[PDB]
Amino acid sequence: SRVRQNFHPDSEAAINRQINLCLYASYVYLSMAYYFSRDDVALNNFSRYFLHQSRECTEHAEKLMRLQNQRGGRIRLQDIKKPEQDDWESGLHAMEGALLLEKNVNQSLLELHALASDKGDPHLGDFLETYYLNEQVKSIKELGDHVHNLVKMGAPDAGLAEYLFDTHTLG
Amino acid sequence: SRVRQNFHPDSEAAINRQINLCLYASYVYLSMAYYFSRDDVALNNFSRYFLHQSRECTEHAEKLMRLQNQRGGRIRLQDIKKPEQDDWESGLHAMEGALLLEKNVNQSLLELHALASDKGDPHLGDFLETYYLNEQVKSIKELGDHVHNLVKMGAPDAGLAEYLFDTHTLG
Amino acid sequence: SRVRQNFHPDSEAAINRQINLCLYASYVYLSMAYYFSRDDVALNNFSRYFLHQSRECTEHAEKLMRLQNQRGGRIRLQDIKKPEQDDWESGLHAMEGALLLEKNVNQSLLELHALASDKGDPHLGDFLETYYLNEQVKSIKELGDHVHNLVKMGAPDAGLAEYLFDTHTLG
Amino acid sequence: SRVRQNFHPDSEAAINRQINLCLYASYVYLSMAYYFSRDDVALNNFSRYFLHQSRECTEHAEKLMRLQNQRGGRIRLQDIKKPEQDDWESGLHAMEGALLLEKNVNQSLLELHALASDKGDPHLGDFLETYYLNEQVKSIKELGDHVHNLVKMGAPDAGLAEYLFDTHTLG
Amino acid sequence: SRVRQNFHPDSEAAINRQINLCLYASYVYLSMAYYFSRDDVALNNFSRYFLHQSRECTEHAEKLMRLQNQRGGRIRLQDIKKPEQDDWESGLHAMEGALLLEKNVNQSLLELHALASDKGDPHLGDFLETYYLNEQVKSIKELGDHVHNLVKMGAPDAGLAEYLFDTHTLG
Amino acid sequence: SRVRQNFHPDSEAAINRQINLCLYASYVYLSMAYYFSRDDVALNNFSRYFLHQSRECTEHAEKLMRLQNQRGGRIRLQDIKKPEQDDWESGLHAMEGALLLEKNVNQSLLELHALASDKGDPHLGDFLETYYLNEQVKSIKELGDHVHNLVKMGAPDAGLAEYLFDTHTLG
Ligand SMILES: [Au+]
Ligand SMILES: [Au+]
Ligand SMILES: [Au+]
Ligand SMILES: [Au+]
Ligand SMILES: [Au+]
Ligand SMILES: [Au+]
């Protein structure tokens, strides 16, 4: 590739893996989003919250696809695995699931950064620092805030908890 | 009638029946609307919600009266029966009553569509598809959402449930 | 009822009767409105005139339902009887029918006022004076004007009469 | 054709026939339009009314030509037959002629819909439902309204009838 | 489910299958979009064209997820399979691949419509007619137009063909 | 006819012939317009060019119908013959066909002018001079320009010719 420079085959491959992971997270959030628009759940702001989290994840994945092409790597897509559940059980359980998901995504991004460092690729390191690492920290912190409030409010069993959290925090 | 074409007498008669039904549903919703403005109920947004549902139903009935005339049928009105109750008991009970009502109205519209198909009347079939069938599905879904939230919140016996649902969801 | 004061059970019952009557008049006018949009009648401004008269009557009925609740009475709905005819025969015959209808409605409102006086209920008396009695007089006078012009013009048998009245007076 | 899918040769041929019919109706209305701008007829609003009906029909025909190409069919034009008359005799006779024309066009469209159903072509069925069937019903109803008023007014022999109908209804 | 009415388990299952298919098509188009932003392809308007086609497909899939919930069905996601190729070879080959893809998607939607008809579900039939069937026909027609022009221009081997098509048609 | 003056029966008849011819040319151009929106032709600006030429021709025909009525002649319509071909083969062949068509139309208009002169009808002569003769010359000149460029560019066999002419000249 006539543009390739300082771009290690392991980095290119790790980027392809992160693209699949970030697409998977997008898919998890889409599943969650339409769980909360079920007639027997009907928490519309939970629904909009996770839909927005889905788009953020799709944008993360496209930016990595764009990075692959900018550096002369070659995008290789894999299946996007279905989420672990279709029934996300409650607003609290979904938020806790999102938190676990974002920490796994964050672990992968951190390992991708360590690889970039090992290979002496400061462009890739800065790319992750500038667009991913702090977004992940903000996302994880926000999900932690929500989990805490939902637990403190008595979710899932206190009938008013998820309803009121839906209308006040997520509205 | 010099405009009548492909318009079966059974369809004309079924349309007259649907007009009475859609007027009845309008009357049920009007009853519900003024139940919630009682001084011993005083849920003003429940009141406005059902009043709006009443108007939607009056518009449905007028559109069917208009269809009758467009096709050369002849409108034949019948008594509009009083609702089953004047005292609708609670916000939850009214919402559940509306849901049952809308499903019966939906069943009638679906049977009217099947008649139109049997008689080869695609204008009538499309009329129902375009203005009634999806409106009924949206309406029924919304009432299901509300019923679910009210139950989850502990209505009717939890004193805060209908009050908070009134101010947050229906406001 | 913790709001009830100076509100006689006969007044409450008479109000429920007037609600049914005012809803009936609304139904009569709706029937008339869609008679004039028949392809073999097709007097669109007669149609709009009676449709407007129908809404005025629905608003009268809702205001009485509202009054019932303001005073602590309890709304009790009855069947809304179908109009005496589906075929209103001509613009003149419909106008004459409306005039008779409004005079009967006016008689009922006047009897309701006399009851309010007998029971010493000046709030109810003023309510009727402020929102019903003069509206009825304006309505009856207008219908008399129209009946007179239609007769003078030679309706129903002079072919130009209802057509020209439709376009000039009711447009 | 690399776009053709689920598109039956009988439907393609029936569409070509409907294109000719809808072009013919356009031609009939053009003939009528310039009959009423004759110095010995001079009903300018009849003229504009039928000219507008002509354009609606040209747009119907072009939409069917467009549908043919969208589905991969092949447009085959035939002669556009001259109207049955150049002298349309009166405003009433022209309106009655338009009504008969629109009912024949409507019959053809309904038969085209039944063919689409038989061939399992829901795209074609919906196309007719969405753009033709209800337009035809509105058109036929309107022509019925006009015919009725013109007859009631005493057209064609009452000298004021077509003149006044021209200025009031069609202006 | 308290909202479910006239909704057959086979329709619910077929809808889940169509959701996976429409998500797959979205994934195919995303793959194509980032193939054309490769430094050794660099047809930016091909890239934007297929990216737009990807979003249209994501919106189709979300609307079906929404329909599932409106009708009381239950969304069940499956893996989204990777596209058949990462290297789409040329602008012509990608357009031909999109055409084949859209015809397969169209076949599935048509089979879904036939199922809805068999089960007497006119809401589902109309949903497909209103939002999918004609969009598919427009899409397939457009891809056919593009394939034709690219072939006529001498793509893929004429060096100016895809470049000029990119700048003129897709810009 | 009380308006007829200096209007020769041969002129009236020749005008009726020109109306049919100008309607025919309109029909030829409509055929051409929808040939270029075929999926295996797909030259959208050729399509819009000939559609515009079709409307110009319809306006020419209506103006002659209007002239007939202004002068007291009587419009007599004949069948509009189908075009010689449905398949117009190429952009060049269609342009050459339009050129031949416009020259025949021009010959007819010139012969109509010579008739007007012979009959001493300067109103008819000026009508043709003012609205037809120079429009025909502009039209024929433009078609000649296009034919020349298309030939010089190597149409129909050079794949880029009609495509580039479509986007640059006709856009
Ligand atoms: Au991500
Ligand atoms: Au209704
Ligand atoms: Au009243
Ligand atoms: Au037509
Ligand atoms: Au799709
Ligand atoms: Au012409």
Author numbering:
A (entry chain A), B (entry chain A), C (entry chain A), D (entry chain A), E (entry chain A), F (entry chain A): 6 to 176
Passage from the reporting paper:
It is a nearly spherical 24-subunits-protein with exterior diameter about 12 nm and a hollow cavity of 8 nm.
Therefore, to create specific Au ions binding site at the ferroxidase center, we re-designed these centers by genetically introducing cysteine residues as potential coordination ligands into them under help of the YASARA software in two steps. Differently, the crystal structure of 2Cys-ΔC shows that one gold atom is coordinated by Cys27 and Cys62 in a linear geometry, occupying the original A site of the ferroxidase site, and this Au ion was buried within four α-helix bundle of each subunit. There are totally 24 Au ions occurring at each protein shell as shown in Fig. 2A3.
